[PDB]
Design a protein around this nucleic acid. Structure first.
Ligand SMILES: [K+]
Ligand SMILES: [K+]
Ligand SMILES: [Mg+2]
Ligand SMILES: [Mg+2]
Ligand SMILES: [Mg+2]
Ligand SMILES: [Mg+2]
Ligand SMILES: [Mg+2]
Ligand SMILES: [Mg+2]
Ligand SMILES: [Mg+2]
Ligand SMILES: [Mg+2]
Ligand SMILES: [Mg+2]
Ligand SMILES: [Mg+2]
Ligand SMILES: [Mg+2]
Ligand SMILES: [Mg+2]
Ligand SMILES: [Mg+2]
Ligand SMILES: [Mg+2]
Ligand SMILES: [Mg+2]
Ligand SMILES: [Mg+2]
Ligand SMILES: [Mg+2]
Ligand SMILES: [Mg+2]
Ligand SMILES: [Mg+2]
Ligand SMILES: [Mg+2]
Ligand SMILES: [Mg+2]
Ligand SMILES: [Mg+2]
Ligand SMILES: [Mg+2]
Ligand SMILES: [Mg+2]
Ligand SMILES: [Zn+2]
Lengths: 125, 98, 127, 80, 24, 60, 155
RNA sequence: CCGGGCACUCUAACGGGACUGCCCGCGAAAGCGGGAGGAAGGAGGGGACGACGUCUGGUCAGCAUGGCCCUUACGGCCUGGGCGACACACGUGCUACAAUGCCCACUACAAAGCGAUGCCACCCGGCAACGGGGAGCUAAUCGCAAAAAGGUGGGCCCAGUUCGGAUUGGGGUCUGCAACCCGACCCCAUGAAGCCGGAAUCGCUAGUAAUCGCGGAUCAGCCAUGCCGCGGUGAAUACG
């Protein structure tokens, strides 16, 4: 049942199904199914309109999600970026932004390796 | 009815100290609770043998603290005399409460 | 009236008090099966009795402390083994050959320096 | 996931040296070594020279950066 | 796994406590 | 152990933090024990002399 | 083993069938010393072979093993700048070893999600003369024999 | 729990115990194979201990030391920065890729250690980290402390998935004069690579390997998944 912006979870327990939304996680999912009183274990396919409507209502009118989230987050990074800010720099240069080592590792933010040439003299290990 | 503590680094410095007491006050006070051996608390120090690098050698040193009790009931008059001031062991320390 | 033993395994001791009865076994105030809740090993513990056709002529009250369940299982095995000979030395003759009367000496070997754990040695490269 | 608690720290070195420079209008430059100090409202509009370890760097502090630290604007290392 | 701080093992491994592993 | 740096003893730390230990025998700052105020080297040395009461060679 | 010839560890008879060969199979199933978890798996499987089959699990077991033992295998060797697959008879002790190992190995290749089922099926499936465990056993024998030309290198 | 009692368990000092002594077989002997009694059997298991010497090995940055060299500076003090850079390469590890598994409950079973301006019971507040109050211990007596793997029940149903937790956005809590460079921790959101790894290569012979958690030193705090120890469950294999 499309809840958050064009979000259709189905054929799975509503709590996890709810997870397929940008802004919802085990935590919040477990919440809405409480403050809306809905056996979380029921399948989305076995939900009830009364329930499917309450869910939409609560979740949508209670949190900033999907497109909005992505937008705000985007805005934020652009922010510390526009201003001088160090983190901005790291976001610019595309390097880790939480005081991590960039000598080794840091692959997640650098992507694949861009190998080069070097010095194979003596135990370079 | 006195409760005495006997701690130390030498286990013979305390045996020649708990008995230094019991036998004495064993003829002027209750038959005493005999010397009770409290478990020991060991302190380990592990050091890299050499001054520079070689972090795989190491030598082990421990400073074990032994303990005793004794505990004589009936804080008699003729007891605090065979004892009181007739100490001998020097590596021992003594606590008293009753 | 009563018959004692002890039994120790991998640093776990157990009080084994045998008494003529059915086959009831109290371990720390619980039924044998209540304590050894689904641990296929359990059976073993009482093996010394079955060895001498006992079990169906005895009862046992067991106290245990130290170590772990399977280590306790063995302590009990030795306690019960000793208590049985405490009731009758003639039990050795055929109880001994099955070992039951021997204390398992193997214990956690010490952790040496330079190793990762007693024997596992650190991994070395381009040697 | 940033956090101090209660007491938005600021070396009074410049604070009582800026909150004062407000009285007689503004000013032109305030070189500091305390990049530890948190930037705050009454700094907006000013220009603080922060020592990066070799030099003091000009920093026109603006509304959009009222909560950040001063060092955050004086990059320490020089890369490629 | 032990790297998931939002799980039991996560907390235990990191030797911490919290929602996902409160002190009894 | 530069003499100038063994000024650590100088209570006046200005900020309690900055205060650190040092070997009371060699000045060594890098691996000083609390219960001895001695670094691992000096410690090993005196222990061998027998000048560290109760301290023995642990084996097990 | 350069000095002696290492005596074989004698195992403790099965807790249920009082069989030593069972403890072995259990051990091989076991990983990370979870002997409990191991034992159960085998047993549940025993009860699974007990259902889908009318024959006794213990006997089904024995058979499979017997069917997966290799009586011949090729052991590689060096001879004047060349390596040769030398067919060699297979030691009884090693047969039991390879058999039990293979069953478990093959078993965990199966598709059935539940461990015990995989052991269950593989085991019975084995006594039937089929199953990947038996195929390995056959490929090995096919390997040997197929190099009988290098058999004079007795080893 | 109380009275009560040291039997038991322990705690820790001192002793007893094994000698190839006994029997058989083989030797010329030393010994070898085997059998009994024994907790233990032929160095019972682990440790400390590493000869004359070799590598002009390592360390003048622990310290000591001959000689050189600087002695408003090659000495000394601060504030800030750096030791934490990154196209890239290797070592050692950690966490994984899942169903012999992951999650949430409920319930068991250790050993070593550490703690008076330090462990911190219990109570209240907070989702929580942690705050506020507060009993107890100079600690076999109080606290750290939950044991986890297990066992029981329930959920997930083979999916990059309730696998995995990288990265990033928020909001907080602590220590500290101060966490931008450059702290750990909590909560919400994010949810990366990864489907078992080419050539090549490491460890281990049994309470070992493999797995599971626990403590300590350093230390305000911590970048420890490192070291040094502790105990639970517990294999495979050795023809040669
Ligand atoms: K030399
Ligand atoms: K990645
Ligand atoms: Mg989501
Ligand atoms: Mg960095
Ligand atoms: Mg080291
Ligand atoms: Mg272990
Ligand atoms: Mg190392
Ligand atoms: Mg997870
Ligand atoms: Mg000097
Ligand atoms: Mg410090
Ligand atoms: Mg220091
Ligand atoms: Mg040289
Ligand atoms: Mg060299
Ligand atoms: Mg010199
Ligand atoms: Mg460095
Ligand atoms: Mg570069
Ligand atoms: Mg690591
Ligand atoms: Mg609360
Ligand atoms: Mg910092
Ligand atoms: Mg992929
Ligand atoms: Mg998969
Ligand atoms: Mg060996
Ligand atoms: Mg630890
Ligand atoms: Mg610390
Ligand atoms: Mg770090
Ligand atoms: Mg740690
Ligand atoms: Zn020193």
């Amino acid at each position: 049942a499309r809840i958050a912006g064009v979000e259709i979870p189905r054929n799975k327990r509503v709590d996890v199904a709810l997870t397929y939304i940008y802004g919802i996680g085990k935590a919040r999912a477990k919440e809405a199914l409480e403050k809306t009183g809905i056996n979380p274990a029921t399948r989305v396919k076995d939900l009830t309109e009364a329930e499917v409507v309450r869910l939409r209502e609560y979740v949508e009118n209670t949190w900033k999600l999907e497109g909005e989230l992505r937008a705000e987050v985007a805005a934020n990074i652009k922010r510390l970026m526009d201003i001088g800010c160090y983190r901005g720099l790291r976001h610019r240069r595309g390097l880790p932004v939480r005081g991590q080592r960039t000598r080794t590792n840091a692959r997640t933010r650098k992507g694949p390796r861009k190998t080069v040439a070097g010095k194979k003299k003596a135990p370079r290990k | 009815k006195i409760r005495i503590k006997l701690r130390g680094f030498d286990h013979k410095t305390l045996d020649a100290s708990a008995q230094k007491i019991v036998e004495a006050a064993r003829r002027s006070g209750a038959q005493v609770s005999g010397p009770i051996p409290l478990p020991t608390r060991v302190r380990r120090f592990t050091v890299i043998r050499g001054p520079f690098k070689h972090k795989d050698s190491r030598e082990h040193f421990e400073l074990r603290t032994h303990n005793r009790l004794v505990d004589i009931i009936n804080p008699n008059r003729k007891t605090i005399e065979q004892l009181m001031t007739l100490d001998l062991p020097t590596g021992v320390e003594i606590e008293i409460k009753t | 009236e009563q018959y004692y033993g002890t039994g120790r395994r991998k640093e776990a001791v157990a009080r084994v008090f045998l008494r003529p009865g059915n086959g009831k076994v109290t371990v720390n105030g619980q039924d044998f099966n209540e304590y050894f809740q689904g641990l296929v090993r359990a059976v073993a513990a009482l093996e010394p009795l079955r060895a001498v056709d006992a079990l169906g002529r005895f009862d046992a009250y067991i106290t245990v402390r130290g170590g772990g369940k399977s280590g306790q299982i063995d302590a009990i095995k030795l306690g019960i083994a000793r208590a049985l000979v405490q009731y009758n030395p003639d039990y050795r003759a055929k109880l001994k050959p099955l070992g039951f009367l021997t204390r398992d000496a193997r214990v956690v070997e010490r952790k040496k320096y330079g190793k990762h754990k007693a024997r596992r040695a650190p991994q070395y490269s381009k040697r | 996931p940033r956090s101090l608690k209660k007491g938005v720290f600021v070396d009074d070195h410049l604070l009582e040296k800026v909150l004062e420079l407000n009285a007689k209008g503004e000013k032109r430059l305030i070189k500091t070594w305390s990049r530890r100090s948190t930037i705050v409202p009454e700094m907006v509009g000013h220009t603080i020279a922060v020592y990066n370890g070799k030099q003091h760097v000009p920093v026109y502090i603006t509304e959009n950066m009222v909560g950040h630290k001063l060092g955050e604007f004086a990059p320490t290392r020089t890369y490629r | 796994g032990k790297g998931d701080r939002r799980t039991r093992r996560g907390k235990i491994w990191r030797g911490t406590y919290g929602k996902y592993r409160p002190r009894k | 152990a530069r003499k100038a740096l063994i000024e650590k003893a100088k209570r006046t730390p200005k900020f309690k933090v900055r205060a650190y230990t040092r070997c009371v025998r060699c000045g060594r700052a890098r691996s000083v024990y609390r219960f001895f105020g001695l670094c691992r080297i000096c410690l090993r040395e005196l222990a061998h002399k027998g000048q560290l009461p109760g301290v023995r060679k642990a084996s097990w | 083993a350069r000095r002696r010839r290492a005596e074989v560890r004698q195992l403790q008879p099965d807790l249920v069938y009082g069989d030593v060969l069972v403890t072995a199979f259990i051990n091989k199933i076991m990983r990370d010393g979870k002997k409990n978890l191991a034992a159960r798996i085998f047993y549940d499987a025993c009860k699974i072979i007990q259902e889908k089959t009318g024959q006794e699990p213990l006997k089904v077991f024995k058979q499979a093993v017997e069917n997966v033992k290799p009586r011949m295998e090729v052991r590689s060797r060096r001879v004047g700048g060349a390596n040769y697959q030398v067919p060699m008879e297979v030691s009884p002790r090693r047969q039991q070893s390879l058999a039990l190992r293979w069953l478990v190995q093959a078993a965990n290749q199966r598709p059935e999600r539940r461990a015990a089922v995989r052991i269950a099926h593989e085991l019975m499936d084995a006594a039937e003369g089929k199953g990947g465990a038996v195929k390995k056993k056959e490929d090995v024998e096919r390997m040997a024999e197929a190099n009988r030309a290098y058999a004079h290198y007795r080893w």
